[PDB]
């Protein structure tokens, strides 16, 4: 699963193509900015506030 070269694209079927789709089109994270640290402060850890 980590290196998809091990799955043979000569014995042609699906498990190479599906493992390619998992690497290509699985969604990526983001960030949205909550909070009002002027009054409330900020209670989160391990991230910036």
């Amino acid at each position: 699963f980590m290196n998809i070269q091990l799955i043979s694209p000569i014995d042609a079927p699906i498990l190479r193509q599906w493992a390619e789709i998992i690497h290509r089109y699985w969604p990526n994270p983001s960030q949205i900015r909550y909070g009002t640290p002027n009054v409330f402060g900020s209670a989160n850890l391990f991230t910036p506030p």
Binding site: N3, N28, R33, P48
Partner: protein, 1023 residues
């Protein structure tokens, strides 16, 4: 230097002149849409092996391809994709041209972001018409786009004084991009969202932007010349694999491509042509706390600082990057090791050292800070790379006065030599056969048959059979029967008869052949019968008919040649049927078969005929029988021997059978048999010291190959360990040729040194108490890639030249003349210092020259002296002390240099040797002994002006007379006794030649035997 993978030494460089840019106008934006054949945005990348288009790099007007690949519906092949794009861009061009007329064309700037996002919306069918009134710019590029909300949020968005665009797809992947190792890498730029750019006016807004928002992956800057205003680049956490031992996320590939572009651009700088950016690098700004110490991001940040300061890589960068080379570079940089460079990355500012050649610190406004504290010890210039030279090239060593102990060199090369390998053997002896003949003369001498020598008893032994079989395997011929029979058949016709005047035999002979084989796909006959019938030999006349007999005939009759058989007589008969297949370990039967064969061979010839019969084992009973019976009944006789395989066989040729006369043996036949047996003895002694045919080597044999393999990272001064190893090789093999080959093996640069040890070099090694050290200056310079080859034991496949074969003839006589424990003095070096390997080990030497020597001085086991004084002068032999002088191939050059005669040169030499203390001496003189033949191609003398005219060297020398030179010794000393050593037919001299791994010849040895007859060496001894 090195960080983890080595870069190039002191010469660091950088571009100097930066060109300035111009704004992107509508006059250019119209021209970019109707893509002409000369100017078009896309340019194709291609595979290096298959030479097929696999990827497309995109430029200025379309760089907004942020959506997925299935949204666009692009074709698979490049030729269809290009026509697709050219067809669609004009449909967009008329839509631009309707709203904005072309009468506004002069100096109207367009918004670059709107220009990219418009074609990105039109190629993806996503609401382009809002962006079209925002195409013409006003008051800046960004602030026209901050407040609006017209375009779709995937293209760009605003966070308040910060514009965020989504840069996408610098490269574009075609249909036949199959992630091959020769494919060009794409650096995660064929993907939808690999980075996000953040545009603003000043950096103080973006620095407050990245206080609230996260900088987890890492943020990147340009700091030299931003594309559309100053901005930051934030990488995502998607991953390009592209390199099967590695996984590289986007924020590392985005840094790595920009590092490699600057490493490439630091080499191409020639200090006259301008570039578009003084540096290409990125220099990570905020996320350096979140990235790991000594991880890939940190190491690429170190390399990105090095590229900005202007360092250069050791191995060269290809013009187009390959996916295998990129993986090798990443695996080379993720190795272990410490940062040798005093540079270190910092978040606050990217620093530039004091003597860095980059002038960008004064060019840009800020970001770059000329730090004065840290200083690097390098001087500025570009590197010098060059071609490959795919054959291994010969190297010669030079020495230095320092030294180590001799037990260090072998112990050092014990871990460096890859001795257990199988070299290709080659061939000892090449070409045709050498004809050694002797003819019966009337007035030489009578000698009885009981005093002739026979073969030794140590002939059927295992080592002797091994020495015969090794030479028979290493001999390279065509057909043995062809080469033997033509050599005997040519010499059998130059003989003239004594009874009449003309000749024994003519054309039209009606001969019989005994012992045909036709055994190796020669269709019916031995291979000489058809050219001898057609007259293709050109030294023979054609006969009338040939009839065959023997056990292995194909067209003749099969009989037993011992017992008589029904046939007729013949005018000539050739018999070469062997008798010694049964003749092993029982000599009597093999001797007994020969007389029974000869009694049948004589009777089938009787009227005035002649026969040729092959004797393999010449024994005393055979000589006695032919002296008793065969010798009276013939007119004349001769015995010759073509030499093509090391054995003791001969050929017996008799002339004028059944003519009753009286003949005896002679001292010519006696000396011929002595030389014939001793030439077997010498080569049989030589062939046992050689290794076997398909051996693997281990360094245990006396002669053989030996190689090393030591790495050489970049322009590194080699250590004492590698120097001791190379000097140990140069002490283990001496005065031989050394071939080297520098090549990247297993992802690492390594060089080999190939040479061939010898018993002469083993003798040389014993003469030194300490081994010298070579200088590394000949090997530290090399920056090329010499492709290697498989090692062979015998390198020279063309063979030795006659001037080398004659040099062996001189050197063997010198080495046989010098005994153990004697002072000598060399009179002239020659081409090399061979003399140090010729004399025995305990003998102290000295050598005179006209040039400074190159042999190492000091740390020897016995005294030596290397000095040059132009030895024709006087007043210097009284200071020196020796016992025998050796002039070899130098007196003719000394005579030709001063343009004096050979008589005056030899007179001056003997006049200066009158002051010597030596008693015995031998020196090379150049005077003809025999009647002059002036052999073609190699030695064309003049009778009048008395020159030699060697055409292979353009040299000529005066010859003198033996009678003119004989009176000089009598005038010099009363008790001198000259002797002229004859050239010995035995080839005794080849011990120096074959054991030092030299495939000799067939013709050049005969030419050297002819050439020594014009330059014989002489030997004088007083009292």
């Amino acid at each position: 230097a090195n960080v983890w993978g080595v870069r190039l030494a002191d010469s660091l460089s950088s571009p100097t002149i930066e060109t300035r840019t111009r704004h992107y106008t509508l006059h250019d934006f119209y021209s970019d849409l109707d893509a002409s054949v000369g100017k078009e945005p896309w340019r194709p990348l291609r595979n290096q092996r298959t030479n097929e288009i696999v990827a497309v790099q995109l430029f200025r007007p379309l760089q907004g391809l942020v959506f997925d690949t299935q949204l666009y519906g692009f074709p698979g092949t490049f030729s269809q994709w290009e026509q697709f794009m050219k067809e669609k861009l004009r449909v967009l061009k008329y839509e631009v041209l309707r709203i904005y007329p072309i009468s506004t064309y002069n100096h109207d700037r367009v918004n670059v972001f709107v220009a990219n996002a418009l074609v990105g919306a039109f190629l993806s069918n996503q609401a382009f018409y809002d962006l079209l009134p925002l195409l013409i710019v006003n008051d800046t590029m960004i602030s026209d786009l901050l407040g609006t909300g017209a375009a779709l949020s995937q293209f760009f968005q605003s966070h308040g004084e910060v514009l965020e665009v989504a840069a996408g797809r610098k490269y574009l992947q075609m249909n036949n991009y199959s992630n091959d190792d020769d494919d060009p890498p794409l650096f995660a730029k064929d993907l939808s969202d690999y980075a996000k750019a953040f545009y603003s006016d000043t950096y103080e807004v973006l620095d407050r932007f990245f206080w609230t928002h996260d900088s987890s992956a890492g943020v990147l800057v340009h700091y030299d010349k931003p594309t559309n205003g100053n901005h930051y680049i934030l990488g995502t956490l998607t991953q390009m694999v592209s390199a099967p031992p590695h996984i590289i996320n986007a924020t590392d590939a985005l840094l790595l491509e920009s590092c490699l572009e600057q490493f490439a651009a630091n080499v191409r700088a020639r200090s006259a042509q301008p570039v578009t950016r003084l540096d290409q690098c990125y220099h990570l700004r905020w996320g350096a706390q979140y990235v790991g110490e000594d991880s890939l991001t940190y190491r690429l940040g170190v390399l990105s600082l090095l590229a900005t300061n202007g360092y250069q890589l050791a191995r060269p960068i290809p013009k187009q990057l390959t996916n295998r080379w990129l993986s090798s570079f990443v695996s080379q940089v993720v190795s272990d090791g410490i940062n040798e460079t005093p540079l270190w990355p910092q978040e606050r500012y990217v620093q530039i050292a004091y003597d860095s050649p980059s002038v960008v610190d004064g060019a840009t406004q800020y970001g770059y800070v000329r730090r004065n504290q840290l200083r690097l010890g390098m001087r500025i210039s570009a590197l010098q790379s060059l071609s490959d030279t795919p054959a291994p090239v010969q190297w010669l060593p030079q020495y230095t006065i320092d030294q180590v102990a001799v037990d260090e060199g072998d112990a050092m090369v014990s871990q460096l030599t890859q001795l257990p390998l199988r070299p290709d053997y080659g061939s000892i002896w090449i070409g045709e056969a050498l004809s050694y003949y002797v003819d019966y003369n009337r007035s030489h001498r009578v000698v009885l048959s009981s005093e002739l020598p026979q073969l030794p008893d140590t002939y059927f032994d295992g080592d002797e059979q091994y020495g015969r079989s090794l030479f028979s395997l290493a001999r390279k011929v065509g057909d043995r029967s062809l080469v033997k029979d033509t050599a005997v058949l040519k010499h059998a016709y130059q003989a003239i008869d004594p009874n009449t005047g003309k000749e024994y035999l003519r054309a039209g002979q009606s001969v019989a052949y005994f012992g045909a084989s036709a055994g190796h796909s020669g269709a019916d006959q031995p291979l000489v019968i058809e050219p001898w019938m057609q007259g293709k030999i050109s030294g023979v006349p054609p006969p009338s008919s040939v009839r065959q007999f023997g056990y292995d005939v194909a067209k003749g009759a099969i009989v037993d040649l011992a017992r008589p058989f029904p046939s007729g007589d013949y005018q000539f008969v050739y018999s070469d049927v062997d008798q010694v297949v049964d003749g092993h370990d029982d000599l009597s039967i093999s001797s007994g078969l020969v007389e029974s064969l000869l009694d049948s061979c004589v009777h089938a010839t009787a009227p005035g005929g002649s026969f040729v019969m092959k004797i393999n084992f010449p024994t005393r009973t055979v000589w006695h029988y032919i002296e008793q019976k065969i010798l009276p009944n013939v007119t004349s006789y001769m015995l010759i021997k073509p030499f093509v395989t090391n054995n003791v066989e001969v050929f017996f040729v008799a002339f004028g059978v059944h003519q009753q006369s009286a003949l005896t043996w002679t001292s010519g036949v006696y000396f011929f048999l002595v030389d014939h047996f001793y030439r077997y003895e010498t080569l049989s002694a030589i062939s046992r010291q050689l290794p076997s045919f398909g051996y693997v080597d281990d360094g245990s044999s006396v002669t053989g190959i030996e190689i090393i393999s030591i790495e050489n990272p970049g322009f590194s001064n080699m250590t004492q360990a590698a120097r001791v190893g190379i000097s140990g090789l140069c002490a283990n093999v001496g005065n031989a040729r050394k071939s080297i080959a520098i090549y990247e093996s297993h992802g690492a640069r390594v060089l080999t040194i190939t040479s061939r040890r010898s018993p002469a070099s083993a003798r040389r090694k014993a003469r030194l108490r300490y081994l010298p050290l070579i200088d590394p200056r000949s090997l530290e310079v090399q920056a090329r890639t010499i492709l290697p080859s498989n090692p062979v034991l015998f390198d020279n496949i063309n063979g030795a030249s006659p001037h080398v074969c004659l040099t062996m003839m001189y050197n063997f006589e010198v080495s046989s003349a010098v005994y153990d424990g004697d002072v000598v003095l060399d009179l002239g070096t020659g081409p090399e210092a061979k003399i140090l390997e010729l004399i025995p080990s305990t003998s102290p030497v000295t050598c005179v020259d006209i040039r400074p020597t190159a042999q190492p001085n000091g740390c020897w086991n016995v005294r030596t002296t290397f000095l040059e004084l132009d030895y024709l002068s006087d007043g210097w032999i009284t200071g020196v002390r020796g016992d025998i002088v050796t002039c070899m191939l130098s007196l003719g050059a000394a005579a030709a240099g001063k343009s004096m005669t050979f008589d005056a040169a030899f007179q001056q030499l003997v006049r200066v040797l009158t002051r010597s203390t030596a008693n015995v001496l031998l020196i090379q003189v150049n005077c003809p002994t025999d009647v002059i033949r002036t052999i073609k191609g190699y030695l064309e003398i003049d009778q009048t002006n008395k020159r030699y005219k060697f055409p292979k060297f353009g040299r000529d020398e005066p010859y003198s007379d033996m009678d003119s030179l004989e009176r000089i010794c009598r005038a010099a000393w009363p008790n001198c006794s000259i002797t002229w050593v004859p050239l010995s037919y035995d080839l005794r001299w080849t011990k120096l030649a074959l054991l030092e791994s030299t495939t000799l010849s067939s013709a050049s040895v005969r030419i050297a035997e002819l050439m020594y007859k014009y330059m014989p060496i002489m030997r004088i001894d007083i009292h």
